[PDB]
Each structure stands twice: as structure tokens, then as C-alpha cells.
Amino acid sequence: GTTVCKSCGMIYTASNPEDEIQHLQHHHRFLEGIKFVGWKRERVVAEFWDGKIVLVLPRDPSYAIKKVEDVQELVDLELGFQQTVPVCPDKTKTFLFIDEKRVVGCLIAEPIKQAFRVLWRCSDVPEPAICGISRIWVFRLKRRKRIARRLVDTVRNCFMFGCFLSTNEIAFSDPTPDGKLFATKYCNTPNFLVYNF
Numbered sequence: 001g002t003t004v005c006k007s008c009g010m011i012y013t014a015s016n017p018e019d020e021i022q023h024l025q026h027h028h029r030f031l032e033g034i035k036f037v038g039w040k041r042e043r044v045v046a047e048f049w050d051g052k053i054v055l056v057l058p059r060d061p062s063y064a065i066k067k068v069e070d071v072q073e074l075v076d077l078e079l080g081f082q083q084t085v086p087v088c089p090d091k092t093k094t095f096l097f098i099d100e101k102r103v104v105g106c107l108i109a110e111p112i113k114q115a116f117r118v119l120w121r122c123s124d125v126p127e128p129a130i131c132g133i134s135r136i137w138v139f140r141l142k143r144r145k146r147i148a149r150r151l152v153d154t155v156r157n158c159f160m161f162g163c164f165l166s167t168n169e170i171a172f173s174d175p176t177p178d179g180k181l182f183a184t185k186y187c188n189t190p191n192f193l194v195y196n197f
């Protein structure tokens, strides 16, 4: 693909009439999915020079829940498979990284009671853990800009508000190769915690 759309990330050949119409339609579906405009209430939990993180809590309004689900449909398409869903959808906390009225990062966190050290295989010895990182995604063109690091930072101070969770209290659900490279660095160990492995 000779052309990269800076706004939806699609890679395609602008010279091709098939491609330009298909990009037009992909571009529309994508920007609708990540657009972040007109929430009556935003629970802003962290502010940065290049964006902010908004927290969506259980029993928040329909429009917030729907926005999370729209983003998750795009992540499902990008991954190409159904990642293990949260056990109880009404206990999850969702963190959205917003930049220029767009969702460019999403972290879904769920309560867990145990996790397992990874060696890929993992140990059969359960370790007590508090917070399961059930989903983590950053828009492709915004990667390697610390968005995922800041989302996990924010989970560590918001998931159990009033305490700062250690990297021994968070675990990563069923990590992808990208997730494994991220978690190894974030946790400063190749033997971080996982669940749904």
C-alpha cells in the first residue's frame, strides 16, 4: 500500500479506484467508532499535554457504555479474533485515552483474585492479584507514545482508588505478542502475571 491515511490509519493504493472508495467507507466506519464528542458528563481521571484519560464506571450512562462497545468492535476487527471477554461485564472499569476528540487508547480492567507468572507458557502456581487488564489497545499511528503506559499507570491509581497498585497486583489477560513486549517493559520483568492463558 502506497498511501497511509493519517486519520484512520488505513494502508491502501490511492491510484486504484477500488481502493479509494473502500478507504472512504472504511474511514467513515472507523472515525465514527472512535469519535469522542458531546458527553454530558466526562469523568476525567488524568490530564496530559497530549490528551486525557476518561473513566467509564459500572452503571454509567448508556452513551458511555455504547462508546466503549463501539471501540471494542474496532479492536476485535484489528486483532482478528474474540479475545476472552470479562467474566462479569458489570464490574469492569474502562479507561479511554482521548486526543483531539478521538479515542486513541482503551484499557478495560476487571477484578480478579489470582494470576500466574509467565515463563511461552505460564506457571501453575497462583499468585494473588487484584486487577486484570482484560483489554488494552492503542490506535496504530499513536503507538510508542506512552499511551498504554499511562493507561496502566491510571489503572494503578483508579482501579482501587485510594491505593497505588504494584506491578505484582496487576495481570494481563491472554496477551498478544505486542502485549507481551509491552508488559515485559512495563513490569520490568519477562515473568509478569497473566490470566486466561
Ligand SMILES: CC(C)(COP(=O)(O)OP(=O)(O)OC[C@H]1O[C@@H](n2cnc3c(N)ncnc32)[C@H](O)[C@@H]1OP(=O)(O)O)[C@@H](O)C(=O)NCCC(=O)NCCS
Residues within 6 Å of the ligand: 135, 136, 137, 138, 139, 142, 143, 144, 145, 146, 147, 148, 149, 150, 172, 173, 174, 175, 176, 177, 178, 179, 180, 181, 182, 183, 185, 186
Ligand atoms: C500493546 C500496545 C497497547 C502498546 O501500546 P503503546 O502505547 O504503543 O505502548 P507504550 O508506548 O506505552 O510502550 C511502553 C514500552 O513498551 C514496549 N513496547 C510497546 N510496544 C511495543 C512493540 N509493539 N514492540 C516492542 N516493544 C514494545 C516498549 O519498550 C515501550 O517503550 P519505548 O517506546 O520507550 O521503547 C500496542 O502495541 C497495541 O495496541 N497493539 C495492538 C493491540 C494489542 O495487541 N493489544 C495487547 C493485547 S495484550
Ligand SMILES: [Zn+2]
Residues within 6 Å of the ligand: 005, 006, 007, 008, 009, 010, 023, 027
Ligand atoms: Zn482514512
